[PDB]
Amino acid sequence: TEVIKNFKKGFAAVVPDEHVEALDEDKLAKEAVKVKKPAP
Amino acid sequence: ATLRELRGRIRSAGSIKKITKAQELIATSRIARAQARLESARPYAFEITRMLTTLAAEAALDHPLLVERPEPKRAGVLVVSSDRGLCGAYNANIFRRSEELFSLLREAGKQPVLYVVGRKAQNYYSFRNWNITESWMGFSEQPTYENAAEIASTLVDAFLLEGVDELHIVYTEFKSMLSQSAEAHRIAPMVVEYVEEDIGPRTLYSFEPDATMLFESLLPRYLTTRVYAALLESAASELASRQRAMKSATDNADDLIKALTLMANRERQAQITQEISEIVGGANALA
Amino acid sequence: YTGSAIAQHWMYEGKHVLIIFDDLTKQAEAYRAISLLLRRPPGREAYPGD
Amino acid sequence: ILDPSVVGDEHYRVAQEVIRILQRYKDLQDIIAILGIDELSEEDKQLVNRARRIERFLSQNMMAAEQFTGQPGSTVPVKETIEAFDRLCKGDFDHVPEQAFFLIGGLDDLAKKAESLGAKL
Amino acid sequence: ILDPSVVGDEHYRVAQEVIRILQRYKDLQDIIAILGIDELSEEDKQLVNRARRIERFLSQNMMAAEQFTGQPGSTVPVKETIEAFDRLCKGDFDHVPEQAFFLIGGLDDLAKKAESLGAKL
């Protein structure tokens, strides 16, 4: 038992890329405060 | 021993078929209830939207939740998923849209920060070694406005600060009961678009105490009612997806019952013929 | 076999023939009948070996 | 002769890994037939994707099949086969669609078909 | 002689309840294997836990099997058996793990092995 336990200390026991292309920025819906005052 | 085996398989497939048909009908009832909830929550959202635009008409648009922060370094994405898992490609479509969003964010120097709603998102993201900032579970089928308030409070507190430059939500939009589409929305910072004039000689609104304080006190309520509407649409979409997936599973179990019954009858006939062959072979060996 | 003989006569004379066997399953069943009546030991599905 | 002392260590290891993945896929086939792939674990989903791609990449356009389809044959050396299937069972192609592994030769044919299908290796 | 007129009313009632629980479990096993246990009711999950504990408590370390498990045998009187399975079917040990029911004798052995796994009853 002690030989095993003293060996165990000497024993030497990342997000995958998924290669998914980027979403179209035109598809990212934007919550907007629709001001009805013209000052662009 | 294959005949007992085939009869047992037929029995098990019949049990599965019954269970999945029951689940499909339950999902029909529950999608009715979820559509009820959605259309009952619509009016307050409409009214707060029109009150917010009335306020913004005469406000100082400088609120942090309304300004585009220069040099965006992080982005907080809230992915809305389900708890129960008898739906179809519902969570799969959610995760595909969230991966597309993460790629769009990495293509702009922004490190995505991950908040999740549901256990399936937790599974998908812990298997992929993501570090989830905060999770929410137990209300993906009957979400209450308190859950939306809590989620949106956490998100806006992460925005105004460890800190993010914008907030996105990946959730399923429900429409027409035959198409539920995973969608990425950017909920903060809100884009200011000056649509029209609409009213020129219009009776001016009185604000109490003032327009700017009301606007900055109403904006987070608008964000949280948006998150509430998102949770409701996601619940309805999940129930629709579960109905569809359970109908598909029932049809698959029925076709499997048919194939197993054909095989069982085939081997039954084969066993009778082989037994007769042995009996008549012995009887001929004796003659 | 009668049909194929009538057709082979034309084939071996330069003609082109088309033969249709409405059902060979029924020929197989009739041959299995004839075999079992001759007390020949059956095989798979009680069909003869040949 | 599928023996480490005949074909080598890498040949035998890649073959055993392919067989293990396909056996796990066959074990899951029942659930997959009734409920689909969406109900499995994430590990099992990854393994089923790898197994579908592997069972399609074992297919090949044979020299004698040119009379049926019109596409010529393909020869793949054994070292290239071992390398390709090592990359498959390691997960280096899990992004390429299920098709484009269908009826091809080595890795160059895979690259050509994936780039014709909008993918890369 | 499994008759209320021979073995008594409580013996017969406990035996019939055990048989009913095990039959319901055998009926649910296929659903649990395909769709998962979380798809059942709460009544059915309760019954499934009880049925697994019951089917493990019917096993026993026999005297003639010491040669196969190294463990000495046990003997349990019929009244202790009746009362133990009554408590199981009622649900008095639904907090003890599935082990500690496996290859033991009476209720004292159950307590010993349950505490050996960090639990009480």
Coordinates of N, CA, C and O in Angstrom, one line a residue, chain D residues 23-87:
Chain D
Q23 N -18.2 0.3 -33.7 CA -18.9 -0.5 -32.8 C -19.8 0.3 -31.9 O -20.9 0.0 -31.6
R24 N -19.2 1.4 -31.4 CA -20.1 2.3 -30.5 C -21.2 2.9 -31.3 O -22.3 3.0 -30.8
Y25 N -21.0 3.3 -32.6 CA -22.0 3.8 -33.4 C -23.1 2.7 -33.6 O -24.3 3.0 -33.5
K26 N -22.7 1.5 -33.8 CA -23.7 0.4 -34.0 C -24.5 0.1 -32.7 O -25.6 -0.2 -32.8
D27 N -23.8 0.3 -31.5 CA -24.5 0.2 -30.3 C -25.6 1.3 -30.1 O -26.7 1.0 -29.7
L28 N -25.3 2.5 -30.5 CA -26.2 3.6 -30.4 C -27.3 3.6 -31.5 O -28.3 4.3 -31.4
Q29 N -27.1 2.8 -32.6 CA -28.0 2.8 -33.8 C -29.5 2.7 -33.4 O -30.3 3.3 -34.1
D30 N -29.8 1.9 -32.4 CA -31.2 1.8 -32.0 C -31.9 3.1 -31.6 O -32.9 3.6 -32.1
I31 N -31.3 3.7 -30.5 CA -31.7 5.0 -30.0 C -31.7 6.0 -31.2 O -32.7 6.8 -31.3
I32 N -30.7 6.0 -32.0 CA -30.6 6.9 -33.1 C -31.7 6.7 -34.1 O -32.2 7.6 -34.7
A33 N -32.2 5.4 -34.2 CA -33.2 5.1 -35.2 C -34.6 5.6 -34.6 O -35.4 6.0 -35.4
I34 N -34.8 5.6 -33.3 CA -36.1 6.1 -32.8 C -36.0 7.5 -32.5 O -36.9 8.3 -33.0
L35 N -35.1 8.0 -31.7 CA -35.1 9.4 -31.2 C -34.2 10.3 -32.0 O -34.2 11.5 -31.8
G36 N -33.3 9.8 -32.9 CA -32.4 10.6 -33.6 C -31.1 10.9 -32.8 O -31.0 10.4 -31.7
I37 N -30.2 11.7 -33.4 CA -29.0 11.9 -32.7 C -29.1 13.0 -31.6 O -28.2 13.1 -30.8
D38 N -30.2 13.7 -31.6 CA -30.3 14.9 -30.7 C -30.3 14.5 -29.2 O -30.1 15.4 -28.4
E39 N -30.6 13.3 -28.9 CA -30.8 12.9 -27.5 C -29.6 12.3 -26.9 O -29.6 12.0 -25.7
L40 N -28.5 12.0 -27.6 CA -27.3 11.4 -27.1 C -26.5 12.4 -26.3 O -26.8 13.6 -26.3
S41 N -25.5 11.9 -25.5 CA -24.6 12.8 -24.8 C -23.8 13.6 -25.9 O -23.8 13.3 -27.1
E42 N -23.0 14.6 -25.4 CA -22.2 15.3 -26.3 C -21.0 14.5 -26.8 O -20.6 14.6 -27.9
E43 N -20.5 13.7 -25.9 CA -19.5 12.7 -26.3 C -20.0 11.8 -27.4 O -19.4 11.5 -28.4
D44 N -21.2 11.3 -27.2 CA -21.8 10.4 -28.1 C -22.2 11.0 -29.4 O -22.1 10.4 -30.5
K45 N -22.6 12.3 -29.4 CA -22.8 13.1 -30.6 C -21.6 13.2 -31.4 O -21.5 13.0 -32.6
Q46 N -20.5 13.6 -30.7 CA -19.2 13.7 -31.4 C -18.8 12.4 -32.0 O -18.3 12.3 -33.1
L47 N -18.9 11.3 -31.2 CA -18.5 10.0 -31.7 C -19.4 9.6 -32.9 O -18.9 8.9 -33.9
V48 N -20.7 9.9 -32.9 CA -21.5 9.5 -34.0 C -21.2 10.3 -35.3 O -21.2 9.8 -36.4
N49 N -20.8 11.6 -35.1 CA -20.4 12.3 -36.3 C -19.1 11.7 -36.8 O -19.0 11.5 -38.1
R50 N -18.1 11.5 -36.0 CA -16.9 10.8 -36.4 C -17.2 9.5 -37.1 O -16.5 9.1 -38.1
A51 N -18.1 8.7 -36.6 CA -18.4 7.4 -37.1 C -19.1 7.5 -38.5 O -18.8 6.7 -39.3
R52 N -20.0 8.4 -38.6 CA -20.6 8.6 -40.0 C -19.6 9.0 -41.0 O -19.6 8.5 -42.1
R53 N -18.7 9.9 -40.6 CA -17.6 10.3 -41.6 C -16.7 9.2 -41.8 O -16.2 9.0 -43.0
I54 N -16.4 8.3 -40.9 CA -15.5 7.2 -41.1 C -16.2 6.1 -42.0 O -15.5 5.7 -42.9
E55 N -17.4 5.8 -41.7 CA -18.1 4.8 -42.5 C -18.3 5.3 -43.9 O -18.5 4.5 -44.8
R56 N -18.3 6.6 -44.1 CA -18.4 7.1 -45.5 C -17.0 7.1 -46.1 O -16.9 6.9 -47.3
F57 N -16.0 7.3 -45.4 CA -14.6 7.4 -45.9 C -14.1 6.0 -46.3 O -13.1 5.9 -47.0
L58 N -14.6 5.0 -45.7 CA -14.2 3.6 -46.1 C -14.7 3.3 -47.5 O -14.2 2.3 -48.1
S59 N -15.7 4.0 -48.0 CA -16.2 3.8 -49.3 C -15.1 4.3 -50.3 O -14.3 5.2 -50.0
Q60 N -15.1 3.8 -51.5 CA -14.1 4.2 -52.5 C -14.7 4.0 -53.9 O -15.5 3.0 -54.1
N61 N -14.3 4.8 -54.9 CA -14.6 4.6 -56.3 C -13.6 3.5 -56.8 O -12.4 3.8 -57.0
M62 N -14.1 2.3 -57.1 CA -13.3 1.2 -57.6 C -13.1 1.3 -59.1 O -13.9 1.9 -59.8
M63 N -12.0 0.7 -59.5 CA -11.7 0.7 -61.0 C -12.7 -0.1 -61.8 O -13.0 0.3 -62.9
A64 N -13.4 -1.1 -61.2 CA -14.4 -1.8 -61.9 C -15.8 -1.1 -61.8 O -16.7 -1.6 -62.5
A65 N -15.9 -0.1 -61.0 CA -17.2 0.7 -60.9 C -17.3 1.7 -62.0 O -18.4 2.4 -62.1
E66 N -16.3 1.9 -62.8 CA -16.4 2.9 -63.9 C -17.4 2.5 -65.0 O -17.9 3.4 -65.7
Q67 N -17.8 1.2 -65.0 CA -18.8 0.8 -66.0 C -20.2 1.1 -65.5 O -21.1 1.1 -66.4
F68 N -20.4 1.3 -64.3 CA -21.7 1.6 -63.7 C -22.0 3.1 -63.6 O -23.1 3.5 -63.9
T69 N -21.0 3.9 -63.2 CA -21.2 5.3 -62.9 C -20.5 6.2 -63.9 O -20.9 7.3 -64.1
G70 N -19.4 5.8 -64.5 CA -18.6 6.6 -65.4 C -17.4 7.3 -64.7 O -16.7 8.0 -65.4
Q71 N -17.3 7.3 -63.4 CA -16.2 7.9 -62.7 C -15.0 6.9 -62.6 O -15.2 5.8 -62.2
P72 N -13.8 7.3 -62.9 CA -12.7 6.4 -62.9 C -12.3 6.0 -61.5 O -12.8 6.5 -60.5
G73 N -11.4 5.0 -61.4 CA -11.1 4.4 -60.1 C -10.0 5.2 -59.4 O -9.6 6.3 -59.8
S74 N -9.6 4.7 -58.2 CA -8.7 5.4 -57.3 C -7.9 4.4 -56.6 O -8.4 3.4 -56.1
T75 N -6.6 4.6 -56.4 CA -5.7 3.8 -55.6 C -5.1 4.7 -54.5 O -4.7 5.8 -54.7
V76 N -5.1 4.1 -53.3 CA -4.7 4.8 -52.1 C -3.6 4.0 -51.4 O -3.9 2.8 -51.0
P77 N -2.4 4.4 -51.3 CA -1.3 3.7 -50.6 C -1.8 3.4 -49.1 O -2.6 4.1 -48.6
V78 N -1.1 2.4 -48.5 CA -1.6 2.0 -47.2 C -1.1 3.0 -46.2 O -1.8 3.2 -45.2
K79 N 0.0 3.6 -46.4 CA 0.5 4.6 -45.4 C -0.4 5.9 -45.4 O -0.8 6.4 -44.4
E80 N -0.8 6.3 -46.6 CA -1.8 7.4 -46.7 C -3.1 7.0 -46.1 O -3.7 7.9 -45.5
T81 N -3.5 5.8 -46.3 CA -4.8 5.3 -45.6 C -4.7 5.4 -44.1 O -5.6 5.9 -43.5
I82 N -3.6 4.9 -43.6 CA -3.4 5.0 -42.1 C -3.4 6.4 -41.6 O -4.1 6.7 -40.6
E83 N -2.7 7.3 -42.3 CA -2.6 8.7 -41.9 C -4.0 9.3 -42.0 O -4.4 10.0 -41.0
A84 N -4.7 9.1 -43.1 CA -6.1 9.7 -43.2 C -7.0 9.2 -42.1 O -7.7 10.0 -41.5
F85 N -7.0 7.9 -41.9 CA -8.0 7.4 -40.9 C -7.5 7.8 -39.4 O -8.4 8.0 -38.6
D86 N -6.2 8.0 -39.2 CA -5.8 8.5 -37.9 C -6.3 10.0 -37.8 O -6.8 10.3 -36.7
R87 N -6.2 10.8 -38.8 CA -6.8 12.1 -38.7 C -8.3 12.1 -38.5 O -8.8 12.9 -37.8

